[PDB]
Amino acid sequence: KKGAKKRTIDPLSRKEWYDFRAPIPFSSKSFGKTLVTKSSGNRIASEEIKGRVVESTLADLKDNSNDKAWRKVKLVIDEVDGRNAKTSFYGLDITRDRLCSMIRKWQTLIEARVDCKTNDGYIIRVFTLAFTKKTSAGKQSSTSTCYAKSSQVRAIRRKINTFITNEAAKLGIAEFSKNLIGEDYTKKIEKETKNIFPLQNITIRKVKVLKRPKL
Amino acid sequence: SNVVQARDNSQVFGVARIYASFNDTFVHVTDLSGKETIARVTGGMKVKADRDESSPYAAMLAAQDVAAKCKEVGITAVHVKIRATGGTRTKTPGPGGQAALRALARSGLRIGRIEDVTPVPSDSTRKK
Amino acid sequence: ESSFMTLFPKYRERYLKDCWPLVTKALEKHGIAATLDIVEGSMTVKTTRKTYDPAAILKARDLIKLLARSVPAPQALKILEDGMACDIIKIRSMVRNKERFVKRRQRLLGQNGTTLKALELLTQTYILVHGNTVSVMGGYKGLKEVRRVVEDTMNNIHPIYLIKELMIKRELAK
RNA sequence: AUAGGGACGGUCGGGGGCAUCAGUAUUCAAUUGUCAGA
RNA sequence: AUAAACUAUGCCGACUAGGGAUCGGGUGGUGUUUUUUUAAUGACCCACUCGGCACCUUACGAGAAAUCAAAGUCUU
């Protein structure tokens, strides 16, 4: 026979490996691995991977993590300890399964954008996702209306955001992230809101690290 | 024909993106946190852009007489990211597809982080 | 394992809720899993360990999308066929005004939906107007012509010129 | 005057200004990595 | 300041109406939920009212008909 190919000098030769790791309340483990090009005098091995960014689904805790596997957490390699990639918080999010998931055509959709201030010297932007809940056994039909007077809508925004700006002013990014992923805030918002109009599927759609001091 | 230069791979390793215009089908496999770029072969293959690469007939001309030379220079088990198609422009996905991701799977590699990277944006420039 | 999701408005829930047993059955022939979340109000499709051709998930991504925009199920599942292509054309971000969008959309469908039907007969495609989207299904060329027609109609270009041009093209092909 | 006018509050508002930012996408670039088509 | 300046439908004065649809108040609430060693409250919902929301609808009146709760509208 006469082959059409033959391996001569692999390109992935000068490749060094690393491990994905971020403290905060996520497992110590080294979930997944990254890759980089060897040093070259000018090029500094573990030092190009500075602004690196990894998107990770929650399997970053062994327990009830496989369940809540829709929070897309985005992390930045913040430091490297020989052969290991250390990471701090960068971003928090969700996915299409969930987003498109809770979207029925007979309810109302609410969104609250917020700029929080953490004592850590960190600036955030947190997006909230709210949906109106029925209360009459009538499965939302063309006959069922679960709308909420626009006045009530913003009524919630005003309340939701205001709750979170105070929540952040009193926490550490390590605490905040831990809390944001937890059904803690789902319950709190649920509390302030049933006062204005009973909601369902409440979520913190997205979180962006606006400006993070490096004191 | 390669060998070493900004080297060298190992390699577990790496990650390869798909993509396929409803008139093509891409195939290339770079590496991590960015990276580039040992692997490619796409549409540039068969027939006379009639059937063409739209129908995966050349997605069979994929990887095999193509990307399977990843086993060549060390690449062992990659990672996919289908982007077909452009947008917008317009979505979504092309022919290939199962031929795409599955193809490279029926050989020296492995599924990993199969993420439809297909890019679209918040209301922009209108087509025609 | 690949996964796609889409949100559907509440006024669609009821319909999906009764026809979902057919959806999964239709999807089961490709070993694709699907879930109808009533809380989030979303439809999700995803591959398994028994999916022969994973590429079919892209077709499965189109299905639920068509279902979200009031495309009837018997018409929607035709997407699973190899030849069938689809296209959901958003028409909400062309006009800043509200009741001008109504005028232009109305002109897109026309009186008794005649113009829309004429479009369907000239591009050989299924077309459905719903809210801020125009869901189309057919050949790729026919879909491109529909997209041009719709987008131009939303930019205050009367569809008469396009219909006449397509009419001439149809006549030339004989 | 269960006219009209106007009080005041309670609002409620995609009301308006007026900036403000947030964003996307776009595109500019720029190195990109490759690297014949496109 | 032209207008592919429009429900081809006036209104200072109003009904045949409803049904439903939306945004006010006032009820019940019973439903949630806040408060937060228990609540009350606050929210969510619920019904129910009355405000008026716009719409939609014709057991009515039309006009010369399609349509109209108006153009219904006083031998036409």
Tab-separated table of C-alpha atoms (C1' of nucleotides) in Angstrom, chain D:
chain	number	residue	atom	x	y	z
D	1	A	C1'	-72.974	71.789	38.147
D	2	U	C1'	-71.538	63.432	39.387
D	3	A	C1'	-69.811	72.057	34.434
D	4	G	C1'	-65.633	74.022	34.043
D	5	G	C1'	-61.514	75.545	36.857
D	6	G	C1'	-57.812	74.800	39.210
D	7	A	C1'	-55.777	72.550	45.767
D	8	C	C1'	-53.621	68.827	47.717
D	9	G	C1'	-52.124	63.905	47.804
D	10	G	C1'	-51.481	58.974	46.095
D	11	U	C1'	-49.854	57.605	42.272
D	12	C	C1'	-48.544	55.591	37.427
D	13	G	C1'	-46.371	55.987	33.485
D	14	G	C1'	-41.688	52.980	26.911
D	15	G	C1'	-44.349	60.703	29.059
D	16	G	C1'	-40.975	64.052	27.725
D	17	G	C1'	-35.963	66.843	28.002
D	18	C	C1'	-31.318	66.477	29.609
D	19	A	C1'	-27.132	64.310	30.142
D	20	U	C1'	-25.343	59.538	32.206
D	21	C	C1'	-23.559	54.842	31.530
D	22	A	C1'	-24.258	49.608	30.144
D	23	G	C1'	-24.165	46.769	26.582
D	24	U	C1'	-24.025	44.177	22.404
D	25	A	C1'	-23.111	43.716	17.508
D	26	U	C1'	-20.770	46.178	14.004
D	27	U	C1'	-16.645	47.854	12.023
D	28	C	C1'	-11.108	50.050	12.882
D	29	A	C1'	-7.224	48.696	13.577
D	30	A	C1'	-3.379	45.394	15.713
D	31	U	C1'	-0.473	41.958	16.333
D	32	U	C1'	-3.232	36.547	15.278
D	33	G	C1'	-2.201	31.851	14.313
D	34	U	C1'	-1.858	29.852	10.443
D	35	C	C1'	-1.985	30.035	6.067
D	36	A	C1'	-4.946	28.711	-0.509
D	37	G	C1'	-7.965	29.845	-1.536
D	38	A	C1'	-11.684	33.193	-0.090
